[PDB]
Write an enzyme that holds these catalytic residues in place. Structure first.
Site, PDB file in Angstrom:
ATOM      1  N   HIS A 121      36.400  27.941 -22.541  1.00  0.00           N
ATOM      2  CA  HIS A 121      36.559  29.137 -23.403  1.00  0.00           C
ATOM      3  C   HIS A 121      37.442  30.192 -22.727  1.00  0.00           C
ATOM      4  O   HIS A 121      37.583  31.282 -23.307  1.00  0.00           O
ATOM      5  CB  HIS A 121      35.188  29.675 -23.830  1.00  0.00           C
ATOM      6  CG  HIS A 121      34.350  28.668 -24.535  1.00  0.00           C
ATOM      7  ND1 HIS A 121      32.979  28.843 -24.719  1.00  0.00           N
ATOM      8  CD2 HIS A 121      34.665  27.474 -25.088  1.00  0.00           C
ATOM      9  CE1 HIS A 121      32.486  27.786 -25.338  1.00  0.00           C
ATOM     10  NE2 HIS A 121      33.508  26.926 -25.581  1.00  0.00           N
ATOM     11  N   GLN A 136      15.276  28.827 -23.333  1.00  0.00           N
ATOM     12  CA  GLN A 136      15.147  28.534 -24.781  1.00  0.00           C
ATOM     13  C   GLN A 136      15.276  27.034 -25.010  1.00  0.00           C
ATOM     14  O   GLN A 136      15.836  26.315 -24.195  1.00  0.00           O
ATOM     15  CB  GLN A 136      16.191  29.275 -25.610  1.00  0.00           C
ATOM     16  CG  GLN A 136      15.900  30.752 -25.770  1.00  0.00           C
ATOM     17  CD  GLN A 136      17.019  31.451 -26.497  1.00  0.00           C
ATOM     18  OE1 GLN A 136      18.174  31.027 -26.444  1.00  0.00           O
ATOM     19  NE2 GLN A 136      16.682  32.545 -27.168  1.00  0.00           N
TER      20      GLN A 136
END
Ligand SMILES: Nc1ncnc2c1ncn2[C@@H]1O[C@H](COP(=O)(O)OP(=O)(O)OC[C@H]2O[C@H](O)[C@H](O)[C@@H]2O)[C@@H](O)[C@H]1O
Ligand SMILES: Cc1cc(F)c(Br)cc1NS(=O)(=O)c1ccc(NS(=O)(=O)c2cc(Cl)cc(Cl)c2)cc1C(=O)O
Ligand SMILES: [Zn+2]
EC number: 2.3.1.-
Length: 278
Positions: free
Chosen positions: A120, A222
């Site tokens: 990215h 998570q």
């Protein structure tokens, strides 16, 4: 799409965490080609927010709040996890590193660029539109979305320098994605650290390892998109996981002497002999 934000954090209780990090050490010892995949969760302990955690950029946007930084990009120090990855590469236990992070901390940690895919981009890296030469700066280049920064190439060129930060629409750098894909396909062990694996194609690279008979470890507070594919799933702080892993491997986490750029990996250093497993 901002994916699923604010999912609950899970914590393996201490005895289960210790057993799983011992299992991670076994997989590292027994694998010949190890690839690590990192996301924003490996920089939260240095004061940079993640995207989808309880205080993530997107999670806080839904509440109409700004994300909170405890540092600038410039003043951020690499975590114990960043420095652990430097050492694993130095002793030859890490073959390649695939990161979704733009925080520039892998590079500034001293991690060799020829073993890193920055899928990215990097806040600190600008690229010449004409000759494709990259400049690793000591400060963030100041633009995002592959815009001109206002500086010109100095190679023996005057080409327009642009930031390397992908916008929503932009496709991944071909070189970095090609190398990340090749590394992921060739790995017998992919380990994800602090990524939700919700962004394609970055988030699917660890599966390339599985699809070809390799093992997959997911370390994340998570749940993740690919939890069902993981051979080993660790719910804990990456720093706690990686410091315990390094103690099992008999490796020290090296000191960070401030921002340092290493273009090319150095020859491998010695490492402890492997235990007799089972
Ligand atoms: N210290 C920690 N230890 C373990 N897990 C942690 C920690 N801190 C946070 N987490 C977990 O770390 C996870 C971070 O997941 P996400 O926030 O989606 O970041 P990404 O890097 O995968 O996002 C990818 C791209 O998305 C954007 O559009 C950009 O382009 C990004 O590059 C969460 O599940 C946290 O529970
Ligand atoms: C710029 C930036 C990159 C990061 F990785 C993290 Br964490 C934080 C920031 N700063 S921020 O507050 O969260 C911040 C977030 C978003 C934007 N604009 S954006 O269109 O929504 C966007 C940015 C990026 Cl890097 C990737 C995507 Cl996929 C989208 C600007 C800032 C800012 O700084 O002005
Ligand atoms: Zn140039």
């Amino acid at each position: 799409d901002k994916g699923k934000c604010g999912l609950p954090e899970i914590f393996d209780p201490p005895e289960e965490l210790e057993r799983k990090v011992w299992e991670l050490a076994r997989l590292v010892w027994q694998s010949s080609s190890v690839v690590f995949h990192t996301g924003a969760g490996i920089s939260t302990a240095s004061g940079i927010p993640d995207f989808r955690g309880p205080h993530g950029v997107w999670t806080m946007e839904e509440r109409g709040l700004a994300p909170k930084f405890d540092t600038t990009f410039e003043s951020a120090r690499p975590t114990q996890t960043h420095m652990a990855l430097v050492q694993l590469e130095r002793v030859g236990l890490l073959r390649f590193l695939v990161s979704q992070n733009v925080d520039g901390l892998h590079v500034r940690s001293g991690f060799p660029r020829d073993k890193l895919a920055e899928l990215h981009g990097n806040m600190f890296v600008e690229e010449c539109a004409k000759c494709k030469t990259q400049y690793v700066r000591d400060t963030v280049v100041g633009t995002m979305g592959l815009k001109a920064t206002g500086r010109l190439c100095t190679v023996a060129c005057r080409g327009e320098l642009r930031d390397t930060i992908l916008d929503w629409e932009d496709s991944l750098p071909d070189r970095d994605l090609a190398l990340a894909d090749e590394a992921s396909r060739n790995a017998d062990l992919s380990i994800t650290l602090g990524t939700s694996l919700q962004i394609r194609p970055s988030g699917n690279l660890p599966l390339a390892t599985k699809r070809r008979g390799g093992r997959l470890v997911i370390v994340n507070l998570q749940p993740t998109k690919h939890d069902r594919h993981a051979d080993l799933r660790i719910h804990g702080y990456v720093d706690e996981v990686m410091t315990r892993l390094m103690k099992h491997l008999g490796l020290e986490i090296p000191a960070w002497d401030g921002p340092r750029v290493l273009e090319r990996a150095l020859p491998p250093l010695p490492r402890p002999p492997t235990p007799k497993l089972e």
